[PDB]
Amino acid sequence: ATKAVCVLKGDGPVQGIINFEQKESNGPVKVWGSIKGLTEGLHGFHVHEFGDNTAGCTSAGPHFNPLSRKHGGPKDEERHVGDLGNVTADKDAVADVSIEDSVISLSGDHCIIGRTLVVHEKADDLGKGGNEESTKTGNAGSRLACGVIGIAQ
Amino acid sequence: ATKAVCVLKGDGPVQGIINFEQKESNGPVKVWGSIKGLTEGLHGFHVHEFGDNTAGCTSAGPHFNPLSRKHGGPKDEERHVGDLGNVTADKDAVADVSIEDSVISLSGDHCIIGRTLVVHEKADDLGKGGNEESTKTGNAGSRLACGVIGIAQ
């Protein structure tokens, strides 16, 4: 019955709080929060490898992928453990997040504690942008805000 | 051969970067970094329970103590897993940290990843302070800066 949390922060107006809960071992992780300061639309929403924030979101590393799969979307079999796809900002720059992934984990093989959550500038083509990059980051662009995923009460 | 890192930040001028390395499982954790913005002198230096930073350093919780023991110094048998004692700011407000604890861990029973590192306003009486509070928090005072301990490369 583990829970985690993450405070997203960046140079920009982008900022938010995201919550993680995984009622059962191995079970799904419910992900929910709110983010403001985003352009209206879709933004790449990924768990990168390191909880390193010494050089800002830059130092977070690549998508978190214990598995050396290519990029992809949440529902894709070939995907990074950390591709949570995209989040949607309404007309008031507010993305209201409610996700439920079964690849990520708050414990065990794909534990994401101590790692960084990043919301990207533009959307994640899920690997359908027709160029090498689309198969790497799904062409997400600059990292607007991040935060180390820490253990909540 | 696991490594971790933490970026300390607070409302004040206090800020810094702290590094964790634990070459062997169960082995000691080498702790080192620099902190600036501190009054010259000694400051309480503790790992608190939660990587929750939603309400700033406030939301970090109590000293991290899986043990349910009494507060104390790093060199005590009776101490919290997270009492790293104190750090020392020179005449230029710079504390240069080099510690080596064997109670904390980057893996296993006393894992501290996903948790918050806090440097306090005043010093940690080490329990030798004369009042119950001394033996709850070594009377450290307001929390000047913190950061969730994340996984480094």
DSSP string across A91-147: TTS-EEEEEEESSSBSSSTTB-TTSEEEEESS---SS-SSSGGGGTT-S--SEEEEE
* B133 CB-near residues (< 8 Å, 6+ apart): B139
Of B49, B61, B151, the CB nearest to A50: B151
Q: Is B22 in CB contact (< 8 Å) with chain A?
A: no
What are the structure tokens assigned to B91, written together?
């005449």
| Tokens of residue A6, six digits | 């993450």
Q: What is the CATH number of domain B1-153?
A: 2.60.40.200
- Per-domain residue ranges of chain B: 1-153
DSSP reduced 3-state for B145: strand
A 33-92 residues inside an 8 A Cβ radius of B: 49-54, 61
Q: Which residues contact B21 (CB under 8 A, 6 or more apart)?
A: B2, B3, B4, B29, B30, B106
Q: Does B131 touch chain A (CB under 8 A)?
A: no
d(CA A62, CA A135): 13
Q: Nearest C-alpha of chain B: how many angstroms from A123?
A: 26
Among A120, A152, A150, A112, which Cα is nearest to A137's?
A120
**Is A80 known to be catalytic?**
yes
The answer to whether A73 and A81 are in contact (CB under 8 A) is no
Q: Which helix (H) or strand (E) holds B135?
A: helix B134-137
A140: three-class secondary structure by DSSP: coil
